[PDB]
Amino acid sequence: MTFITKTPPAAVLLKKAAGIESGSGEPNRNKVATIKRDKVREIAELKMPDLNAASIEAAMRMIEGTARSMGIVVED
């Protein structure tokens, strides 16, 4: 289906928003990669038709469980 269909994982694109692309190793203190909700969901919208979800409730869902099991949070 064109040059796509193999969309990436929401753990590599979501963390992108916040800015945790493996900087190098600076776990000083605090800083838990916070991803606003108006942004995390936005990404789920771009892959909405690539995740096979019927609506955001189905997409943003994988973005909350996928953007949390890694350590990132979400500000509703």
UniProtKB/Swiss-Prot annotation:
Q: Give one GO molecular function term.
A: structural constituent of ribosome
Q: Name one GO cellular component term.
A: ribonucleoprotein complex
Q: GO terms for biological process?
A: translation
- Does the keyword RNA-binding belong to this entry? yes
Post-translational modification (record): One or more lysine residues are methylated.
Key words, A-Z? Methylation, Ribonucleoprotein, Ribosomal protein, RNA-binding, rRNA-binding
Q: Which family does it belong to?
A: Belongs to the universal ribosomal protein uL11 family.
Q: What does this protein do?
A: Forms part of the ribosomal stalk which helps the ribosome interact with GTP-bound translation factors.
What does the subunit comment say? Part of the ribosomal stalk of the 50S ribosomal subunit. Interacts with L10 and the large rRNA to form the base of the stalk. L10 forms an elongated spine to which 2 L12 dimers bind in a sequential fashion forming a pentameric L10(L12)2(L12)2 complex.
Q: What is this protein called?
A: Large ribosomal subunit protein uL11
| Protein source organism | Geobacillus stearothermophilus (Bacillus stearothermophilus)
Q: Which residues of the full protein are shown?
A: 59 to 133 of 133
